Amino acid sequence: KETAAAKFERQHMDSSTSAASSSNYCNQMMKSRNLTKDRCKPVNTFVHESLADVQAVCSQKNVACKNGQTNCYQSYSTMSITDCRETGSSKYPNCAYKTTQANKHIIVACEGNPYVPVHFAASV
Numbered sequence: 001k002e003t004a005a006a007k008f009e010r011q012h013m014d015s016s017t018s019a020a021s022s023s024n025y026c027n028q029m030m031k032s033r034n035l036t037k038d039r040c041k042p043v044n045t046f047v048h049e050s051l052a053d054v055q056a057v058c059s060q061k062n063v064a065c066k067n068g069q070t071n072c073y074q075s076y077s078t079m080s081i082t083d084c085r086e087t088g089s090s091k092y093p094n095c096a097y098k099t100t101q102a103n104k105h106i107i108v109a110c111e112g113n114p115y116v117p118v119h120f121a122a123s124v
């Protein structure tokens, strides 16, 4: 199995682009990251920052997670992100996503040793 840290990297990191540049970004990335293999993953966010900047969020503002957990952290600054969500015209295996680029603070849940992001919670 994939470790929790590696799964977070695979699903959310995209340090190779500064931002989504086309409406087809989500369709291409969801496929490239294998998120449309067994089913169409309904929602997913990609972060366009270096891995080190994202891992550093685990040392930033500690805030509560929606589920009540207390290992969530919010980034002090805004980051370049792309939210990908299936449209109503999406049916596996023909997955289709709406791409929405934005600059916002991210919230992640951290764990382990080293203590790194394991779950993408939300953006503000």
Ligand SMILES: [Cl-]
Binding pocket: 010, 033, 034
């Ligand atoms: Cl994979």
Ligand SMILES: [Cl-]
Binding pocket: 043, 044, 045, 120
């Ligand atoms: Cl997500």
